[PDB]
Amino acid sequence: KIERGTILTQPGVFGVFTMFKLRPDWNKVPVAERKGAAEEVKKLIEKHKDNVLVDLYLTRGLETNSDFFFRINAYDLAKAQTFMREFRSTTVGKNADVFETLVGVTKPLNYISKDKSPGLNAGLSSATYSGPAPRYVIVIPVKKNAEWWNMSPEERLKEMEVHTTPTLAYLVNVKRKLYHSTGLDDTDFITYFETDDLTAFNNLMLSLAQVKENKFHVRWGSPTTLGTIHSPEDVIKALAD
Amino acid sequence: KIERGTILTQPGVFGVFTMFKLRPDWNKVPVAERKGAAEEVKKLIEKHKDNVLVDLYLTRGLETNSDFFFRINAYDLAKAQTFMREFRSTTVGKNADVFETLVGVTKPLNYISKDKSPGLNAGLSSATYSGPAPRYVIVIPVKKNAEWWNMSPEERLKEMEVHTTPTLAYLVNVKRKLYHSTGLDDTDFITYFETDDLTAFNNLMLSLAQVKENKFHVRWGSPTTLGTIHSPEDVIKALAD
Amino acid sequence: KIERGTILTQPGVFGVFTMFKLRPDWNKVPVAERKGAAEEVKKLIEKHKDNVLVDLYLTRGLETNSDFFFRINAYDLAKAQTFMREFRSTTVGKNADVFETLVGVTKPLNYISKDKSPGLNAGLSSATYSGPAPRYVIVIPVKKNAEWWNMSPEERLKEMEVHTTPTLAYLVNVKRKLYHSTGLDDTDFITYFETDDLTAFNNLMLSLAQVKENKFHVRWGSPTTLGTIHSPEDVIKALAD
Amino acid sequence: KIERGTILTQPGVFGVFTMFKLRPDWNKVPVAERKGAAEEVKKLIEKHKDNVLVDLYLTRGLETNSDFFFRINAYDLAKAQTFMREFRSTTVGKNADVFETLVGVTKPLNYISKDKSPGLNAGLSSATYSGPAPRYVIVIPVKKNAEWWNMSPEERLKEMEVHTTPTLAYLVNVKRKLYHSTGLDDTDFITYFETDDLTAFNNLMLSLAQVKENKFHVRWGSPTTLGTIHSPEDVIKALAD
Amino acid sequence: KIERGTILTQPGVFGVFTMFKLRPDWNKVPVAERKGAAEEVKKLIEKHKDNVLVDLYLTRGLETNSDFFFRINAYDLAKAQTFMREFRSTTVGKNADVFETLVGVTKPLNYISKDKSPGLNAGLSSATYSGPAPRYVIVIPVKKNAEWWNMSPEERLKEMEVHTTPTLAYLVNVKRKLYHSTGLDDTDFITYFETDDLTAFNNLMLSLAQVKENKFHVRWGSPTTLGTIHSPEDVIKALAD
Ligand code: HEM
Ligand code: HEM
Ligand code: HEM
Ligand code: HEM
Ligand code: HEM
Ligand SMILES: O=N[O-]
Ligand SMILES: O=N[O-]
Ligand SMILES: O=N[O-]
Ligand SMILES: O=N[O-]
Ligand SMILES: O=N[O-]
Ligand SMILES: [Ca+2]
Ligand SMILES: [Ca+2]
Ligand SMILES: [Ca+2]
Ligand SMILES: [Ca+2]
Ligand SMILES: [Ca+2]
């Protein structure tokens, strides 16, 4: 068992994000096989119901380098691998190349904890999304330089309390998840957002752009991937025609 | 309901720039199929009359990584997506690859407003383009560094008052629009120009290269895209033979 | 009416260089349709007698990302577009991809002009190429940084006077034309050289690598394109077997 | 003769890491020939029993730019070349492109030797991996700037003494191997790791991110390759379906 | 008349290195035509006995972006071009893509001459390559920043005296050639080496990395190409099976 509620909430969980882009020779796959494609993916996800949690998102028309992308959660990285491997054997899998992959792992809080920063940590854990279900997904890999990592845990804590201050407000607006990747893939972190209000999301990024921590970023995007939230079959249903 | 003159004037409007490149195997779609590509597009635009505003520019012969590009404006990014997704299902859509996409959103004035900078804002608002209808479009994404963003509002406004001083004069020549992207795509801004005088346009950028604000650009083109303005069908008619 | 001696001499003249690479399936065009491809380019050039000036250079064998490139000069960028657009409809045109395009425009002298720098300006106009018909062309795109442009025109003039002092002597040896690109493409300038002496030309760059101006280059080649000068019909003829 | 236990333990051994990516026309190799592909690699590996040591890793589903990768060890680079060259003629070989290659060579200890740092060396040599056979491999190419190389051996020793201090403890968890590359390929080192505990691997990197040495990396990944450990024929069997 | 001993030794000699990578559809050229492709290259090289000097190296299995590469020496770049151009029409030629090209020219000594640095000129010119016919080739493009070029000749001399010192001991071990490129291509230098001791070569490069001059490299590799020495026909025979 892998309950969506729990797995998204616990440490030690692997995320594997994989951006795929359909090849042109998918248009020539017979309108028939293509329309059977969504069901095949749906079935695959059920098969791996107990090994990994699957999310699928539609970026076609909004992104140069992906038509759609998966988020995979697993307690076992090898299991994430197995699912993705089987996905690429599927009809759609066979007609799309991979354009990006980010591997990450969930960890406990490093800075804004009950021990280290009790005040902000309360604001954090007792904050709650309000309003329309989010339609938009944003995924943003982040890497910081040696200079940041060479700061004292005390100095980086103060920087991260600065990060947390103007941003708590946006938790009514925007959902967030943080994955950790240093040494696992070419990025320090993989950040995941769901929102309905992009203008708000824009203001949120500017907020964080304007603080000292931004000064240490060497990757903060590239790609910034913003696509649209749907059920797995519905994403494949949209790629069909 | 979407009137051209309204949506290009209002805040909260999503811009979706998408630069397309036709594959070779388009010169092998028969002349006849190719020539009816233009009506297909024309009919897609009328179909989305009320969802999006569509602009289409010829870049073939002027740009390495596009033959053409769209500008879509929308009150709903999701509707920009759908239109784009449906354009890529079009005869022309099926024989072209995407090579760049820029997402952005219109905002109110940040710096040169009636409150913050009355003198220049007057100058800006009360100035109107003169002479021959623009033949050329230019689209330039811009990203400023963490250092720019960590300067105070007062420091940043001074720098934008500098940007605006030498440029106001060029509004008799050049038309402009400013989209905002931080956190939504890999760029801070997407700028849009229409002019008939490219020599002017050159003198305009040099005016800007020459000031302090240019010191914080980490992206200021790449790609700088200059193409030629036509009606949507006229762009596809041109791409056909 | 467009006369080579006049258009290459006047300000406000648009330059469009475009580097093409032949696709593997060009060897599969029956040889002779290939050889008669040259007549087709010849006819296109005469057809546009009145619209653009055309040059064609062979780079196959000397460059990674081109077999050949055009130089177009026009009074109307639009007409250069049409020309190129019509070349890509050509038989050769249908078997080559574009790998680079540089757009620029001719301007009056900025620094080394009769008023500003009387002595060098005289040396410049009254200097005259000797020795053999140049065999080689070099095209170098150049971009300078915000720091250069943020120097006052006095400081930059001094620097351009420094550029011009060791270089006048190379005018017997080497032929130059300077196009201007800021805001029109992803470079500050396009530089164009014809020489027969490649050792001399290397000595020329090093002279210029060793002055303060070089400190401000963020692009100075990339690609440095050195190819071989011929008539248009001869370059296609060469590309044929 | 080449024995695993020895060649992995000695200086002067050439490492050749090659990352391959299967092309889409491999799913069109007949299920028959594809299933026969594994035994063919298995026999190729036996045929070179006495020439090179072969490792083969599975990255499909965890990596954009590879599906599988080899680690060859040889006393003779030529021989590692011949094996690879012969692998590429294999059924799988003829269906994959190379996306990365790293050539390195083993050397005696430069810093934490018995002579120079006896304290840490005792800890490094008498430390022993515990618990589960490693399911994951990580390969990281690392290159340090001119600044690092221009520090004195005393200063660089101090910094490697700093590298070793937090890391020795991960030797119960993580297996390491260091190859050297300056002058031979585009990196200063190739590091190789095997571990079962990716969370522990992440913390190990963060340990090292946080010390002064990290300040001199110009390459530390790019790519970071993390795949999954199996027998040569199993990797291929997994690529087949 | 071109003798290998003279042309490799004289100033004013053009070097053209060209890295090819074989396209997958070469494996589908009839085995027969592939075996015949070697004699073809051999006859073409005879054909240009007197136009160029040709060397050809095997990189398949050791390099991502080449299977083979040519070194052409000519007294006339245009003849190098014809040669390469005729090679690309050859059977193998028609099945490979160009992945790198470097054009360079041989010059007299700039620093460690008899006039300017007598002592070291002696060292250099007196010790001679001993040791086994070299199995390995290395080719490294090198480009130095504007800071370097702006140092006085006296300062750069002092730097190159420090380069030369540690290298003197590898005179028995490693063969070198230096071409100059500034202004002719996108590098300052192309360096060429033949050796049988890769460990030694690694130690030589580390010695050079550790001197001040390494501080001014902006390109010193990328690619670093290391491959294997054979007769041209043997190289193409190597690519056949
Ligand atoms: C607006 C709502 C947000 C809140 C309440 C928030 C809160 C936090 C907190 C409390 C931490 C520290 C957690 C820990 O170390 O255990 C953190 C870390 C982080 N956040 Fe956010 N954040 C928000 C939005 C964002 C955005 C828009 C980004 C940009 C992608 C972002 C990027 C990051 C990154 C990269 C880290 C890890 C920094 C490090 O490695 O030390 N967050 N965030
Ligand atoms: C001559 C015509 C131009 C005029 C009158 C003009 C005016 C302005 C004004 C008044 C602003 C401030 C808007 C605000 O904060 O609300 C602005 C912002 C901006 N402009 Fe222009 N501009 C012109 C040409 C250009 C050009 C050629 C570029 C180059 C792409 C450019 C790029 C930008 C960017 C990137 C911003 C936003 C800066 C920021 O985020 O703080 N503008 N412009
Ligand atoms: C040896 C023959 C050369 C001569 C006589 C020469 C002369 C000049 C002169 C007089 C100017 C100023 C023109 C003006 O501002 O209106 C100029 C500008 C320039 N030259 Fe050359 N030059 C020569 C070679 C080169 C070479 C080898 C390069 C390298 C690409 C080069 C690159 C440039 C660039 C980029 C500019 C414009 C600088 C700016 O934008 O302010 N020139 N040259
Ligand atoms: C936790 C287990 C590790 C231990 C016990 C360890 C230990 C060492 C030691 C003792 C040396 C000096 C060897 C010598 O000079 O002869 C060394 C060098 C090196 N290590 Fe590690 N290391 C570990 C993990 C890592 C990791 C995670 C990396 C990151 C890729 C790494 C990268 C390197 C590199 C690039 C060098 C060469 C430094 C140089 O060129 O001077 N090591 N390591
Ligand atoms: C190991 C045997 C080597 C010897 C005996 C040697 C010797 C020299 C000498 C004497 C010069 C000055 C030539 C002149 O100014 O005319 C020179 C220049 C140069 N060497 Fe080597 N070198 C060796 C190895 C290397 C290596 C491994 C590299 C790196 C690939 C290298 C790269 C260069 C470069 C880029 C220059 C040009 C310096 C400049 O442009 O000012 N050399 N070398
Ligand atoms: O720190 N929000 O991923
Ligand atoms: O600031 N003109 O987009
Ligand atoms: O300044 N010669 O382009
Ligand atoms: O020092 N571990 O490669
Ligand atoms: O400095 N030897 O190319
Ligand atoms: Ca990776
Ligand atoms: Ca994006
Ligand atoms: Ca452009
Ligand atoms: Ca290499
Ligand atoms: Ca070149």
CSV table of C-alpha atoms in Angstrom, one decimal, chain C residues 2-3 17 22 25-27 34-35 40 42-43 62 66 85-86 91 98 103-104 114 194 196 216 236:
chain,number,residue,atom,x,y,z
C,2,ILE,CA,21.1,48.2,-57.5
C,3,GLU,CA,24.7,48.7,-58.4
C,17,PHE,CA,24.1,36.6,-43.8
C,22,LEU,CA,23.3,20.4,-47.0
C,25,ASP,CA,19.6,13.2,-48.7
C,26,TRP,CA,21.1,15.8,-51.1
C,27,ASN,CA,23.6,13.1,-52.3
C,34,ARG,CA,22.2,18.7,-58.7
C,35,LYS,CA,24.4,20.2,-61.4
C,40,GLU,CA,18.4,27.8,-60.9
C,42,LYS,CA,21.7,31.9,-61.2
C,43,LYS,CA,18.2,32.6,-62.6
C,62,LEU,CA,36.3,24.2,-43.8
C,66,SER,CA,27.8,25.2,-43.0
C,85,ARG,CA,12.6,32.8,-48.8
C,86,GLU,CA,12.7,32.2,-52.6
C,91,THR,CA,16.3,22.7,-55.5
C,98,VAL,CA,19.8,26.9,-42.0
C,103,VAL,CA,20.8,40.5,-39.6
C,104,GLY,CA,22.5,43.9,-39.5
C,114,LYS,CA,36.1,63.5,-40.3
C,194,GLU,CA,38.0,39.3,-47.7
C,196,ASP,CA,44.1,36.3,-49.7
C,216,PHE,CA,34.7,43.9,-23.4
C,236,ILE,CA,26.6,25.5,-56.3
